RNA sequence: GAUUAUUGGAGGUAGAGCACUGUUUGGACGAGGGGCCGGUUACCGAAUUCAGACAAACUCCGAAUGCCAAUUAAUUUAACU
RNA sequence: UGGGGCGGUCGCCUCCUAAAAGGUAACGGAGGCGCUCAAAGGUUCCCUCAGAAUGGUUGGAAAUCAUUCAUAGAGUGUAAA
RNA sequence: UCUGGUGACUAUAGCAAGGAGGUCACACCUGUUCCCAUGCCGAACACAGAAGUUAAGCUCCUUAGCGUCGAUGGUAGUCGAACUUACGUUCCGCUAGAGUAGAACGUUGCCAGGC
């Protein structure tokens, strides 16, 4: 006998083992990330105070298409980078969640990296 | 005397002046020691480093604060308002 | 019976003589029993003689429970030899008690019979004692 | 499907004379003597067995 | 298993020291590290 | 089953406590539904009489001041050695 | 997926009358099977292990893998190392296309009276089955195989226990 | 500097306790190798339980007192190089 | 050196004695050392315990494999911590 | 006023049990061609689809049943003092462990939707 489960708790555990040496100073805030199944959501957060700094999403209607599963997040990285052009347009603290530098992640990552911001 | 037989359990170490060195409240240096230990009885927190021998040193100068860490564990903080 | 027959170390420390009974001060297995009024050691042997006496007086009568085991050794050198060039071998095993600490219990036999047997056991014993019933109320 | 240690199987048309139970697989990449389409265009080399002909219960 | 003395190419001195194991590592090992003559991490080999 | 008590007060020292427990009385503390953590003391003798009269359990009327309270035991601290009692806990069922 | 719809009909016919799963989302499916061989004592039988590998290479889609001994258990020559294993994970369409194959060569050479067996389970939904390699390699009859072996076959099911393994064994199995 | 009300903290003694390690009971449970024909039954061993006890080199717990330091406050008279 | 002597030992590491800071003797009690690992090192990225039963081609029980609990007991290069 | 992570509060925060919730998100899944993917699986990871999902997971509601903490009082123990000669006695303070009443099945900050 054996059972199937949710992966998000493992994501979160790995995320916690990451967060140890990794926190939003409110100078290089932590860029927290989440893909559930369909849309990928993101938030620049201060952790010195624990308070947000932005709010962005794939299913956020501003950057919204039916492109790739991937270029969607890339668009979001451009859009949130413009949002950061307001402030926090600098090199900051990136969080790979309990995820990897690959796929949707890497796409959106370089999107935000090359849409102005130099973490 | 006459035949005094021998033994062996007469061997031990030279102790190591372990434990703490400073207390909750007092003010410190940058290269200052606060605790000689083994393992991690207490974990360094703020402005503290764990050297080779699990020796804890406050990074900076300031006051000390021992405190709990989790539900059941301990840590150390150092604050430099001073 | 239900024991790890081994030990950790041989030469251990001579325990605390003073104090009080941490427990074992009540009747559980038998109905009648004996508790104590002193706080001294036992040498694995007054028990032997005592249960022998109680048995052979009971004529293989009632049932009996010892609440004891010498968990602990002592040592002794040979006769009055010079001092401090080691620690002597063991000579026996002991288990100190406390006043109030039960020692023996019995059932399946008369009150007075038990009383007599226990009295008789005490006489090969080094400690003042007391005969007791199953506590109630 | 342990890739890295995966040889090739294939859903072969085990076309036996006893009911032609051609719903099997393996590395029996043999000559398709019966290049059929209702079953796999592969080996019917499973020629004769008793699994569908003579069971000890229903022979 | 000996006191292992690596000879740099042109750092000019008999400087660096480490452990080896002849059974594990009988041949001549080489690798990168800072020879301060040049301000860089450069290769040296056993000799 | 209508036993009385008398109220303890604060800082009953080692001395007065040993004296009272040595007297023909015993300290008690009651709590539970219908009551607070109330500290009193009671005659050992009548307590034992009602024990032998009722058994282990009994909804007893308890006279403190004016009120007769239904109560039973919570537990008790009892010395087997010398077979006298040192403390008795009580629980009210109301 | 040959026995797939066969099972999909028997559930709605039998276990939707006995078990009555409140949603199709909660329907009892099999997960997979592990096909780990056993010892294959390759203290010098490296070649016998190669042969038992090549057996499952062709029987199954994946070959096994040789678990080095974690221990130095006496009464057996093994140590840190000592490749003494074999391990195979049959999940998907291979699982089904192999299932229909093996139950269709099983009774001819297994020589079983029940048709396959009645039980060897361990009380979980896992068979703990040991064998003598009769029905297997119907691709290569027992002419060139060097050594009898029997895997440790374990059902892996969404079902609860071996009692339900029986109910699903009702599909092209003879318990 | 010292002493004391006040704080704040470190720590695992004493005591308590089985929660590990154990050491020990008793009784049970069932089974095992085995009384036999592979088994019964007993037997032990082990597990499991009930209940119980012991511990310098056992601890889930945990004092008092002492130790360290505070803007520590008050009274003294030290203290250091 | 509980006279000398014979015996035995003579330098480091770990525990207990050592008395809840540290420290602390005994010809007092228990164990280790006179190295190893270029991978058992560094970095990055994955994984996560034996054991027990659970039981089964093996089955000496248990090798291997199988499911649940397992408190890290597993394991952690070398003694105990 | 549901979600998301973000959260700081120790689990009286829980465990287990019982019930509702529905592809706003959640996840079931469709498969592997696509990057990627696994000393040994599209298992996982990653890829591409959302086809059907609350059944699971998940939220809420109930049980404190398991756990947790946890009184009051009291005990030992212990400072100190004074006694005497005691495996001590007494007085003064500190007052534990265990037990026991009892409890709680969460507070909570951020954001943008959702409201």
mmCIF file of N, CA, C and O in Angstrom, chain A residues 3-42:
data_model
loop_
_atom_site.group_PDB
_atom_site.id
_atom_site.type_symbol
_atom_site.label_atom_id
_atom_site.label_comp_id
_atom_site.label_asym_id
_atom_site.label_seq_id
_atom_site.Cartn_x
_atom_site.Cartn_y
_atom_site.Cartn_z
ATOM 1 N N UNK A 3 0.576 5.897 -0.798
ATOM 2 C CA UNK A 3 -0.315 7.040 -0.988
ATOM 3 C C UNK A 3 0.365 8.162 -1.768
ATOM 4 O O UNK A 3 1.585 8.338 -1.676
ATOM 5 N N UNK A 4 -0.437 8.922 -2.526
ATOM 6 C CA UNK A 4 0.016 10.120 -3.234
ATOM 7 C C UNK A 4 -0.392 11.355 -2.436
ATOM 8 O O UNK A 4 -1.422 11.344 -1.755
ATOM 9 N N UNK A 5 0.414 12.413 -2.522
ATOM 10 C CA UNK A 5 0.306 13.567 -1.632
ATOM 11 C C UNK A 5 0.418 14.863 -2.436
ATOM 12 O O UNK A 5 0.462 14.862 -3.665
ATOM 13 N N UNK A 6 0.462 15.985 -1.711
ATOM 14 C CA UNK A 6 0.778 17.281 -2.297
ATOM 15 C C UNK A 6 2.265 17.587 -2.156
ATOM 16 O O UNK A 6 2.898 17.273 -1.145
ATOM 17 N N UNK A 7 2.817 18.209 -3.191
ATOM 18 C CA UNK A 7 4.229 18.557 -3.205
ATOM 19 C C UNK A 7 4.529 19.892 -2.541
ATOM 20 O O UNK A 7 5.700 20.186 -2.271
ATOM 21 N N UNK A 8 3.508 20.705 -2.275
ATOM 22 C CA UNK A 8 3.766 22.067 -1.835
ATOM 23 C C UNK A 8 4.385 22.098 -0.458
ATOM 24 O O UNK A 8 5.172 22.992 -0.155
ATOM 25 N N UNK A 9 4.034 21.151 0.393
ATOM 26 C CA UNK A 9 4.642 21.128 1.710
ATOM 27 C C UNK A 9 6.131 20.877 1.607
ATOM 28 O O UNK A 9 6.921 21.452 2.357
ATOM 29 N N UNK A 10 6.529 20.042 0.659
ATOM 30 C CA UNK A 10 7.943 19.784 0.455
ATOM 31 C C UNK A 10 8.615 21.004 -0.127
ATOM 32 O O UNK A 10 9.755 21.341 0.227
ATOM 33 N N UNK A 11 7.926 21.660 -1.057
ATOM 34 C CA UNK A 11 8.389 22.942 -1.557
ATOM 35 C C UNK A 11 8.664 23.871 -0.400
ATOM 36 O O UNK A 11 9.705 24.523 -0.340
ATOM 37 N N UNK A 12 7.741 23.910 0.546
ATOM 38 C CA UNK A 12 7.801 24.867 1.634
ATOM 39 C C UNK A 12 8.880 24.494 2.626
ATOM 40 O O UNK A 12 9.512 25.359 3.232
ATOM 41 N N UNK A 13 9.115 23.208 2.788
ATOM 42 C CA UNK A 13 10.173 22.771 3.674
ATOM 43 C C UNK A 13 11.523 23.120 3.098
ATOM 44 O O UNK A 13 12.389 23.660 3.794
ATOM 45 N N UNK A 14 11.707 22.827 1.821
ATOM 46 C CA UNK A 14 12.932 23.213 1.149
ATOM 47 C C UNK A 14 13.087 24.723 1.169
ATOM 48 O O UNK A 14 14.183 25.246 1.386
ATOM 49 N N UNK A 15 11.971 25.428 1.025
ATOM 50 C CA UNK A 15 11.950 26.878 1.086
ATOM 51 C C UNK A 15 12.397 27.365 2.446
ATOM 52 O O UNK A 15 13.099 28.369 2.554
ATOM 53 N N UNK A 16 12.001 26.663 3.495
ATOM 54 C CA UNK A 16 12.402 27.061 4.833
ATOM 55 C C UNK A 16 13.878 26.801 5.051
ATOM 56 O O UNK A 16 14.590 27.647 5.603
ATOM 57 N N UNK A 17 14.366 25.654 4.583
ATOM 58 C CA UNK A 17 15.795 25.383 4.652
ATOM 59 C C UNK A 17 16.588 26.366 3.807
ATOM 60 O O UNK A 17 17.799 26.503 3.998
ATOM 61 N N UNK A 18 15.920 27.044 2.881
ATOM 62 C CA UNK A 18 16.551 28.101 2.110
ATOM 63 C C UNK A 18 16.530 29.410 2.880
ATOM 64 O O UNK A 18 17.545 30.110 2.980
ATOM 65 N N UNK A 19 15.383 29.741 3.461
ATOM 66 C CA UNK A 19 15.127 31.027 4.091
ATOM 67 C C UNK A 19 16.057 31.322 5.248
ATOM 68 O O UNK A 19 16.133 32.471 5.695
ATOM 69 N N UNK A 20 16.741 30.307 5.755
ATOM 70 C CA UNK A 20 17.644 30.459 6.882
ATOM 71 C C UNK A 20 18.710 31.511 6.620
ATOM 72 O O UNK A 20 18.934 32.393 7.453
ATOM 73 N N UNK A 21 19.363 31.442 5.466
ATOM 74 C CA UNK A 21 20.435 32.355 5.112
ATOM 75 C C UNK A 21 19.962 33.391 4.125
ATOM 76 O O UNK A 21 20.771 33.966 3.390
ATOM 77 N N UNK A 22 18.662 33.646 4.105
ATOM 78 C CA UNK A 22 18.022 34.303 2.978
ATOM 79 C C UNK A 22 16.795 35.033 3.499
ATOM 80 O O UNK A 22 15.801 34.404 3.871
ATOM 81 N N UNK A 23 16.873 36.357 3.539
ATOM 82 C CA UNK A 23 15.775 37.140 4.067
ATOM 83 C C UNK A 23 15.768 38.525 3.451
ATOM 84 O O UNK A 23 16.815 39.100 3.140
ATOM 85 N N UNK A 24 14.557 39.053 3.295
ATOM 86 C CA UNK A 24 14.375 40.388 2.771
ATOM 87 C C UNK A 24 14.746 41.418 3.811
ATOM 88 O O UNK A 24 14.009 41.651 4.774
ATOM 89 N N UNK A 25 15.870 42.078 3.588
ATOM 90 C CA UNK A 25 16.389 43.072 4.505
ATOM 91 C C UNK A 25 15.559 44.350 4.526
ATOM 92 O O UNK A 25 15.813 45.222 5.361
ATOM 93 N N UNK A 26 14.566 44.474 3.643
ATOM 94 C CA UNK A 26 13.910 45.729 3.293
ATOM 95 C C UNK A 26 14.839 46.679 2.541
ATOM 96 O O UNK A 26 14.488 47.845 2.331
ATOM 97 N N UNK A 27 16.021 46.207 2.138
ATOM 98 C CA UNK A 27 16.941 46.908 1.258
ATOM 99 C C UNK A 27 17.165 46.114 -0.011
ATOM 100 O O UNK A 27 17.066 46.643 -1.123
ATOM 101 N N UNK A 28 17.474 44.837 0.160
ATOM 102 C CA UNK A 28 17.329 43.815 -0.862
ATOM 103 C C UNK A 28 16.166 42.961 -0.407
ATOM 104 O O UNK A 28 16.370 41.938 0.257
ATOM 105 N N UNK A 29 14.930 43.353 -0.680
ATOM 106 C CA UNK A 29 13.804 42.583 -0.172
ATOM 107 C C UNK A 29 13.759 41.218 -0.821
ATOM 108 O O UNK A 29 14.346 40.973 -1.876
ATOM 109 N N UNK A 30 13.042 40.328 -0.166
ATOM 110 C CA UNK A 30 12.919 38.962 -0.625
ATOM 111 C C UNK A 30 11.840 38.917 -1.688
ATOM 112 O O UNK A 30 10.746 39.457 -1.501
ATOM 113 N N UNK A 31 12.160 38.288 -2.801
ATOM 114 C CA UNK A 31 11.245 38.168 -3.918
ATOM 115 C C UNK A 31 10.546 36.816 -3.859
ATOM 116 O O UNK A 31 11.025 35.840 -4.441
ATOM 117 N N UNK A 32 9.399 36.762 -3.189
ATOM 118 C CA UNK A 32 8.708 35.507 -2.938
ATOM 119 C C UNK A 32 7.831 35.151 -4.129
ATOM 120 O O UNK A 32 7.290 36.023 -4.817
ATOM 121 N N UNK A 33 7.699 33.846 -4.354
ATOM 122 C CA UNK A 33 7.284 33.283 -5.633
ATOM 123 C C UNK A 33 6.335 32.124 -5.376
ATOM 124 O O UNK A 33 6.417 31.471 -4.331
ATOM 125 N N UNK A 34 5.442 31.859 -6.328
ATOM 126 C CA UNK A 34 4.472 30.779 -6.188
ATOM 127 C C UNK A 34 3.905 30.474 -7.562
ATOM 128 O O UNK A 34 3.302 31.343 -8.183
ATOM 129 N N UNK A 35 4.049 29.238 -8.013
ATOM 130 C CA UNK A 35 3.222 28.699 -9.085
ATOM 131 C C UNK A 35 2.396 27.560 -8.516
ATOM 132 O O UNK A 35 2.918 26.728 -7.769
ATOM 133 N N UNK A 36 1.097 27.565 -8.806
ATOM 134 C CA UNK A 36 0.220 26.547 -8.246
ATOM 135 C C UNK A 36 0.010 25.406 -9.228
ATOM 136 O O UNK A 36 0.480 24.288 -9.002
ATOM 137 N N UNK A 37 -0.705 25.679 -10.314
ATOM 138 C CA UNK A 37 -0.680 24.833 -11.502
ATOM 139 C C UNK A 37 -0.675 25.606 -12.807
ATOM 140 O O UNK A 37 -0.095 25.122 -13.783
ATOM 141 N N UNK A 38 -1.284 26.785 -12.856
ATOM 142 C CA UNK A 38 -1.642 27.450 -14.098
ATOM 143 C C UNK A 38 -1.006 28.818 -14.213
ATOM 144 O O UNK A 38 -0.489 29.175 -15.277
ATOM 145 N N UNK A 39 -1.028 29.584 -13.136
ATOM 146 C CA UNK A 39 -0.539 30.948 -13.114
ATOM 147 C C UNK A 39 0.474 31.077 -11.994
ATOM 148 O O UNK A 39 0.389 30.376 -10.981
ATOM 149 N N UNK A 40 1.441 31.954 -12.206
ATOM 150 C CA UNK A 40 2.552 32.160 -11.290
ATOM 151 C C UNK A 40 2.453 33.570 -10.733
ATOM 152 O O UNK A 40 2.320 34.541 -11.482
ATOM 153 N N UNK A 41 2.546 33.669 -9.422
ATOM 154 C CA UNK A 41 2.300 34.864 -8.647
ATOM 155 C C UNK A 41 3.565 35.205 -7.880
ATOM 156 O O UNK A 41 4.341 34.318 -7.504
ATOM 157 N N UNK A 42 3.775 36.499 -7.662
ATOM 158 C CA UNK A 42 5.025 36.982 -7.107
ATOM 159 C C UNK A 42 4.784 38.229 -6.278
ATOM 160 O O UNK A 42 3.829 38.981 -6.501
#
